[PDB]
Amino acid sequence: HHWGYGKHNGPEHWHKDFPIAKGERQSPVDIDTHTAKYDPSLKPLSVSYDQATSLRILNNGHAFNVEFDDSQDKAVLKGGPLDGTYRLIQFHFHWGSLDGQGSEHTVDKKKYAAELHLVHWNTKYGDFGKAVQQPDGLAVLGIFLKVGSAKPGLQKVVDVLDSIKTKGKSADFTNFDPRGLLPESLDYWTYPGSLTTPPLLECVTWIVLKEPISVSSEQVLKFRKLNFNGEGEPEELMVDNWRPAQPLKNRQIKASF
Ligand SMILES: NS(=O)(=O)c1ccc(NC(=O)c2ccccc2S)cc1
Numbered sequence: 563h564h565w566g567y568g569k570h571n572g573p574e575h576w577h578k579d580f581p582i583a584k585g586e587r588q589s590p591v592d593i594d595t596h597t598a599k600y601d602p603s604l605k606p607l608s609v610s611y612d613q614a615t616s617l618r619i620l621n622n623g624h625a626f627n628v629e630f631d632d633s634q635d636k637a638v639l640k641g642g643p644l645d646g647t648y649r650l651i652q653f654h655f656h657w658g659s660l661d662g663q664g665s666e667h668t669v670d671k672k673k674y675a676a677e678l679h680l681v682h683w684n685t686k687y688g689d690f691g692k693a694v695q696q697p698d699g700l701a702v703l704g705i706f707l708k709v710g711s712a713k714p715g716l717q718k719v720v721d722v723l724d725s726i727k728t729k730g731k732s733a734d735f736t737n738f739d740p741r742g743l744l745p746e747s748l749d750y751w752t753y754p755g756s757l758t759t760p761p762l763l764e765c766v767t768w769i770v771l772k773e774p775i776s777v778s779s780e781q782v783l784k785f786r787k788l789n790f791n792g793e794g795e796p797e798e799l800m801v802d803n804w805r806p807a808q809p810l811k812n813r814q815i816k817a818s819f
C-alpha cells in the first residue's frame with residue numbers, strides 16, 4: 563500500500579505515514595496575489611543553466627524526472643531570497659487529466675494545466691541527501707504551464723516519454739537544455755515550504771514564476787499517456803499527480819515585483 567494519488571492512497575492519506583503532512587510549512591499553497599507583498603530586500607534572481615548536463619529520464623511511478631549530473635558546479639540558481647548557491651539536480655512536472663487542473667500551486671485559486679519543478683540543493687550542505695535535513699536545504703523553481711502554443715524546448719522530453727511509459731523505466735537523456743523551458747520574465751513569488759510529495763520534508767524555499775509557459779494540447783496529452791503502474795500491470799494513466807493547496811498558516815508570500 564504505497565502512497566499515490568488515488569482515493570485510498572492519495573493526499574488525504576499521506577499524513578498517516580508522514581505526519582509532517584499537517585505541518586507548519588507545507589506546500590503547495592494558493593498564491594493570493596493581492597496579499598503577497600513586494601519585498602525590496604530580494605536580490606536579483608539568477609538562473610544559470612548554460613552548463614547544465616542532463617543524464618537520464620525516469621518514470622518513478624509518481625511523475626517523470628529529468629536528472630542532471632550535479633557532481634560539479636554547473637546549472638545553479640542563486641540570488642532572489644536565496645543565500646548562497648543552489649545546484650540543479652532534476653526537474654519534473656505535475657499535471658491533470660484535463661486542461662482545467664494539474665498545477666500544485668494556484669494563483670488566486672486558479673489552477674494551471676501543469677507545473678514544472680526545477681529542484682536544486684544548497685551547495686553548502688555537500689549533497690542532496692544532507693540538504694534535505696536542513697530548513698534551507700532546497701530551492702524549487704516552479705513554472706506554470708498553460709495550454710496554447712507549443713513549447714519547442716519541451717518536445718525532446720515529450721518524444722522520449724514513450725520509452726519510459728511505466729514505473730521503474732529509465733532512458734538515457736543527455737544534452738537536454740532546461741533554458742528552453744523558461745518564460746521571458748523571472749518575476750516571482752517566494753515563500754518557505756516543503757516537498758509536495760512524501761516525505762513532504764520542510765526544507766524548501768519556493769520560487770514560483772508569475773509568467774507561465776505555453777505548451778500545446780498535443781504535448782500535455784502525451785504526458786497523460788504515461789502510467790503510474792509498472793510494466794505488465796493494469797494500466798492506470800499518470801494524470802492528476804498533484805497535491806492540492808495546503809494551509810498557509812504562519813507564512814507570508816513575498817513578490818519580487
Ligand atoms: N514536488 S517537489 O516538491 O518539487 C519534490 C522534489 C523532490 C522530491 N524528492 C523526493 O521525494 C526524494 C527524496 C529522497 C531521495 C530521492 C527523492 S526523488 C519530492 C518532491
Ligand SMILES: [Cl-]
Pocket residue numbers: 568569798
Ligand atoms: Cl484511480
Ligand SMILES: [Zn+2]
Pocket residue numbers: 654655656679758
Ligand atoms: Zn514537484
